Amino acid sequence: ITTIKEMGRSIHEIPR
Amino acid sequence: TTIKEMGRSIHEIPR
Amino acid sequence: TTIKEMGRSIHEIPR
Amino acid sequence: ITTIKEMGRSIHEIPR
Amino acid sequence: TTIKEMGRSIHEIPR
Amino acid sequence: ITTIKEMGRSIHEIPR
Amino acid sequence: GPSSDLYLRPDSQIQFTRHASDVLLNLNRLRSRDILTDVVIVVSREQFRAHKTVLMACSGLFYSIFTDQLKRNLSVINLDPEINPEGFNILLDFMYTSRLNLREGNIMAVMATAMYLQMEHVVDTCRKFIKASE
Amino acid sequence: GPSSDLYLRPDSQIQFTRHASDVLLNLNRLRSRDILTDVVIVVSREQFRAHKTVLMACSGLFYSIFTDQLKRNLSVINLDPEINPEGFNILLDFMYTSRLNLREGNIMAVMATAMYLQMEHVVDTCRKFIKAS
Amino acid sequence: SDLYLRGGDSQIQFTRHASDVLLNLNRLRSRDILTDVVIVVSREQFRAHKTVLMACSGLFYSIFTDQLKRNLSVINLDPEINPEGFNILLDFMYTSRLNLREGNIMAVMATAMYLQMEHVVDTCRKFIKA
Amino acid sequence: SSDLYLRPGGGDSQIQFTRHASDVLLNLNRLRSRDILTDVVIVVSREQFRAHKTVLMACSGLFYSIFTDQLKRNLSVINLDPEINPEGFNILLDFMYTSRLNLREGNIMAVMATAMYLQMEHVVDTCRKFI
Amino acid sequence: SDLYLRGGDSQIQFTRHASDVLLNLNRLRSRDILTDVVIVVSREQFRAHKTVLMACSGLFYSIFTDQLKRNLSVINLDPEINPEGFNILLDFMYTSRLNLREGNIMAVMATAMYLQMEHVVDTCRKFIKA
Amino acid sequence: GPSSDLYLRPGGGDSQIQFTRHASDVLLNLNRLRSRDILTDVVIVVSREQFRAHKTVLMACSGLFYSIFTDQLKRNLSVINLDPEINPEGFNILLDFMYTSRLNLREGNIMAVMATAMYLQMEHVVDTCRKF
């Protein structure tokens, strides 16, 4: 299986 | 003073 | 209430 | 080697 | 403020 | 007895 | 000198660099053992057991639903009939593992599901992935 | 040729290398807003809110509590009086941030708390830390 | 005729000798005979024999093998160490008996880690799990 | 609520380390053999033995008597009576630090006589049976 | 001819020798060289040389001349004794200087009486009368 | 007016009393301790003749003894054998000097004190001897 690495934020950031 | 620990941090719940 | 521990109790100073 | 187990007190008992 | 004391300072251990 | 007064330092000074 | 002081002499902070991954693996193990799961998501009659906290952590949709104080005690949620059960299962595994598994033939399903769940960073990564194809 | 096929041509896997950190940060934000926190830990004078799921993930103690059949729907837990609230606070922040903050004056408290919570990997890291001092 | 005592190369094993020795060391300690160190744990003082401390504790083993600090007779433990925990471990060293009460269990356990008595710590870990 | 107490009923627990005393003696012998913290040398016919005073007092009425006198307590070299056999003494010293008494034909009487001199009657009684 | 030097028995007197010795003893103390006792004054610790303590204090003289008290390395003073007063007197023993401040004069004076330093007490009585 | 506030030292300054013969008093008591064999911790052996002393007094006065006892290995020695070339009487004169401030030179031993003091690395004594 061709694996690819994504290094950016994966999900929304719930705010303070 | 910050120190980086790279080993497992908590118990591993088994399957 | 007593419990018996039978393993080595302290470090072993080396030869 | 002939080994023998002695089970009585081995030394004088220092008193309190 | 300093002042000078000139008498024996301590007990004399005997011979 | 002939006594003489020496007034200089008598011994080495142990340093701090 | 006749004495000595046995003193712990460092204010330090230890940073456990794989702690977050270790946690997610344990959250996933809880899910697979059905330990402390508190919602069932149902997609075209298929049932998926989950932790609400992990759902709001990853998805704008579930974040919006469960930050509603009245809807916070729901235990069964049926997604919109348009949603593909397979797409949802792929995104749920992503939430609990960091892996997004795509077969030739399901990218559009996964993307659409991710758009519905409002997982925009995933959608963007799917957009790049598509363009690596067509 | 009059035709062409616009087909998505990849069996691939995308690995999001900071997703686990992103999740943990969001769990921390939810905790800081009392969102879905479902246990209150009472440590002498002080009360702490947490997600049972995060506590079971990190602490063998809580894992045993909450997989205990009778004890699973508990909503308030009183720790042993011996436990220091400041020590527990440091370990709770560790669970949600990966950062373990040690001050001169609390190392023993942190370690003892972690032994109580059965956080053996932390105890081991504390042992290493103590030995370097 | 020749009367010879054997040639069986024999060994006699006194199965309670070590236990006897330890009790006598405890008697010497309580009668303050030949104790040569004072351990200070938050202003509180404990007299003991260095050799027994080095035998049981890696921490003390390391102090008293330091070649330069050969004449130490006073050791000040870190201010965090609990005097009651230390006293239970000191009795343990001299008696093989570790006494735990509700209210001091964690103190004994953490003090034992500071003293580098890992086998005691492990026994405590087993203890608080059941 | 629920209250997590390590030993709820204000209990009284004791752990007994059944091999602790044996572990200590072995470490004492390790210290002895590496000359760590030994504080007396026993001299038996121009032969020298290093030991810990505390271990000697625990095992021997003779040494217990010497070192309970304050004047004699800070002695660091003790010359045993010239009649005492170095080999017999070395066997009894090893016994003190190991619980094991080694007898070969040719030293049994030596160990025995050394044991009375050191006033180790339990060892003497065990030696007497051994014949 | 016979060259024989000098003949009278001559004596050279080094007028600052004792002061020199005392300064070197103080340097040894501050470098923690050969200090062999710890004085404990309501939980505070002071390291010193027994010989200097016996030279200056009747109290310490009697402790360290006791046949039984041969291995003492830790002395606990009476709980009433003031740590600051004692430290001023210890500095005095090693330096010949007695430093008195408003707020500690009576402590120095009464501690000096406890330590049986009667000549220092008399000098403090002269001081307090001025 | 009707009240008064008593202060032992009003100008909360800083008073110091200097005991001008204290150091001499200390040394005399040290010599008394030595002659009564109280708390001596080293014996110096000079051609089978023995002298008891306090290590601190030796280190205070002699660069040799300072060097020996600043070695941790040699710090708990309790018997030190000086070189056989050193004269027992010359050594005894320097020991008394250490404990009394007074160096006694008689016809027949001045050279002995001289060599001994150089051996002990007591240069101030050596120079004062050379003038003599």
Author numbering:
A (entry chain D), D (entry chain H), F (entry chain L): 1341 to 1356
B (entry chain C), C (entry chain G), E (entry chain K): 1342 to 1356
G (entry chain B): -7 to 2, 6 to 129
H (entry chain A): -7 to 2, 6 to 128
I (entry chain E), K (entry chain I): -4 to 1, 4 to 127
J (entry chain F): -5 to 125
L (entry chain J): -7 to 124
Authors' text:
The 129-residue BCL6 BTB domain forms a symmetrical strand-exchanged homodimer that contains two lateral grooves that bind corepressors with high affinity. We showed that these can mediate the formation of a variety of highly porous lattices, and that a guest protein may be incorporated into a BTB-domain lattice by its genetic fusion to a corepressor peptide that binds to the lateral groove of the BTB domain with high affinity.
We next attempted to increase the affinity between the back-to-back associations of BTB domains in the lattice, with the intention of creating indefinitely long filaments that would form a scaffold for the recruitment of guest proteins. Such an extension might also allow flexibility and versatility in lattice assembly. We therefore introduced two additional glycine residues between the NCoR1BBD2 sequence and the BTB domain within the NCoR1BBD2-BCL6BTB chimera, with the rationale being to extend the interface with the HP region. Thus, upon crystallization in the presence of the high-affinity NCoR1BBD1 peptide, the two chimeric BTB domains each assembled into filaments that formed open lattices. This system might therefore be used to accommodate a guest protein that is recruited to the BTB domain via its genetic fusion to the NCoR1BBD1 sequence.
